[PDB]
Design an enzyme around this catalytic site. Structure first.
Site, PDB file in Angstrom:
ATOM      1  N   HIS A  74       0.850  -1.218   0.000  1.00  0.00           N
ATOM      2  CA  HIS A  74       0.000   0.000   0.000  1.00  0.00           C
ATOM      3  C   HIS A  74       0.868   1.244   0.000  1.00  0.00           C
ATOM      4  O   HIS A  74       2.068   1.101   0.105  1.00  0.00           O
ATOM      5  CB  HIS A  74      -1.022  -0.058   1.149  1.00  0.00           C
ATOM      6  N   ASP A  78       5.447   2.923   5.393  1.00  0.00           N
ATOM      7  CA  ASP A  78       5.953   1.640   5.937  1.00  0.00           C
ATOM      8  C   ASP A  78       5.958   0.530   4.880  1.00  0.00           C
ATOM      9  O   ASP A  78       6.507  -0.546   5.172  1.00  0.00           O
ATOM     10  CB  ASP A  78       5.232   1.219   7.218  1.00  0.00           C
TER      11      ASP A  78
HETATM   12 ZN   LIG Z   1      -0.810   2.058   6.290  1.00  0.00          ZN
HETATM   13 ZN   LIG Z   2       1.123   0.008   8.670  1.00  0.00          ZN
END
Ligand SMILES: [Zn+2]
Ligand SMILES: [Zn+2]
Length: 217
Positions: A74, A78
């Site tokens: 995504h 991170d």
């Molecule tokens: Zn996220």
């Molecule tokens: Zn995350």
């Protein structure tokens, strides 16, 4: 904070764990994978930073692997933080079109390769990227390893609380979680971004947590 950690899960599958202070969450512990196909390595999510991405790549290159590609689950940093550094190192970066649009809209560096298909084989018969629908984010993907029956759920798998709701779709998440459970009921192991590794019941726990979060909203 500590350097990135690398731990073998089973033959050809490793967990990478990185640590970063994120405004409003304190120090976030983030898991991704490295998947080996012969002497080729694929990064499933980047660490938060170029520094940790370089440590991760160096560990595998030093043990005789070529980094043949990365997939980001995504748009959040991170999963994508290392894309810019990987692009500079000629390591193919992949993201869905939706993820790349979200990166572009947030002023972030895009993956060089993109795809629109619901199911994308990063590696034929070995690494499947699947879009179950919106949840944690609009663009969130999972990665499936059919040989090991390991599912990497990224920040979609949330068995004990949904975490950051800022970019979340609470209305869609239960439907997306049932799609995921229907697709990968055979999973032996579910690795998540922030939770303990577990069995296929973590997909049911996620569905329960999404329902609870939507009802509370
Ligand atoms: Zn996220
Ligand atoms: Zn995350």
């Amino acid at each position: 904070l500590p350097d990135l950690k690398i731990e073998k899960l089973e033959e050809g599958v490793f967990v990478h764990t990185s640590f970063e202070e994120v405004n409003g969450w304190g120090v976030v512990t983030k898991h991704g994978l490295v998947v080996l196909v012969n002497t080729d390595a694929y990064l499933i999510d980047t660490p938060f930073t170029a520094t940790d991405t370089e440590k991760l790549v160096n560990w595998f290159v030093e043990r005789g692997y070529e980094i043949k590609g990365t997939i980001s689950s995504h748009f959040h940093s991170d999963s994508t933080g290392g894309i810019e550094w990987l692009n500079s190192q000629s390591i193919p970066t992949y993201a869905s079109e939706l993820t790349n649009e979200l990166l572009k809209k947030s002023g972030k560096v895009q993956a060089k390769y993109s795809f629109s298909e619901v199911s994308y084989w990063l590696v034929k018969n070995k690494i499947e990227v699947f879009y179950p629908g919106p949840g944690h984010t609009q663009d969130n993907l999972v990665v499936w390893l059919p040989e090991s029956k390991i599912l990497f759920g990224g920040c979609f798998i949330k068995p004990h609380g949904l975490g950051n709701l800022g970019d979340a779709n609470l209305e869609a998440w239960p439907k997306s979680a049932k799609i995921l459970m229907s697709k990968y009921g055979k999973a032996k192991l579910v690795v998540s971004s922030h939770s303990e590794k577990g069995d296929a019941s973590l997909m049911k726990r996620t569905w329960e947590q999404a329902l609870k979060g939507l009802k509370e909203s």
